[PDB]
Design a protein around this ligand. Sequence first.
Ligand SMILES: CC(C)c1cnn2c(NCc3ccccc3)cc(NC[C@H]3CCNC[C@@H]3O)nc12
Length: 285
Amino acid sequence: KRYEKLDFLGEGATVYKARDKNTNQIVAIKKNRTALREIKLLQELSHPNIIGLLDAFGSNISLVFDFMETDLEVIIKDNSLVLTPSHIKAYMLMTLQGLEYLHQHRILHRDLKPNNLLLDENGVLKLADFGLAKSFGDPNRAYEHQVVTRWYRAPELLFGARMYGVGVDMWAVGCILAELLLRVPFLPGDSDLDQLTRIFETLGTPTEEQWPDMCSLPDYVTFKSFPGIPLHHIFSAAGDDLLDLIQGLFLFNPCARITATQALKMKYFSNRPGPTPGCQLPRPN
Ligand SMILES: CC(C)c1cnn2c(NCc3ccccc3)cc(NC[C@H]3CCNC[C@@H]3O)nc12
């Protein structure tokens, strides 16, 4: 009644474009117990790189956010675009500044993947779809457990961990970074077992030194030994500063794995070339 419905945008939920009658501004309208958890976590937060919940109303519920023009998946899949090292540095910087904020507020995203990083027409990247986000402390049930799509999913979750932390988001950011570099999914498992296969044959089956607790995980099972592939072989364009960020994000021990803040202090972010101005980031038609 306050927002002029315009164009359909998705079905998961159900999203629509709309024009607010008061300000005339363009927004996106998204239309349960976790529905309130979502509004709870979001009405709180304010960060340029986190989508901004502008309004809500009941009677299925309707979340009003700012319109976004595109997302990393679209960009990644757009052959017309060539991503430069500066482009990639920019996307990551914004992604990690948003994730550092979330984590400082003891929140896990738990569903980080390229289509959940949205971009506005000024090249501001924003984390979105907090339908799985939870406060760090909240417990994980066995049969209600919500887990990212398997290609971005961290090894501890594939081994059925119920106690976990930021490393689950940091792994997903590693898989996103790899996808920006290769322009295809990094680790495209065709099953949860095959997702681990792929992880180990790419990165090496973990030693006990690399991952002390691994064997005590609930769904731990014995895979063959794979040596893995050197990252400079996988990512042949990447400088040494980037290689070290990647390696940091893909450490098997979830407690050794690099945090958003540790990532952000990495030489990579202070080295030339600098991150593209948002207004210069590549745009699809
Ligand atoms: C609900 C809010 C976060 C939002 C703002 N703009 N916008 C657009 N904009 C158009 C668009 C087209 C292509 C790629 C991305 C966005 C599409 C869209 N689609 C719904 C889901 C789809 C899966 N990824 C998260 C999206 O919010 N949701 C939204």
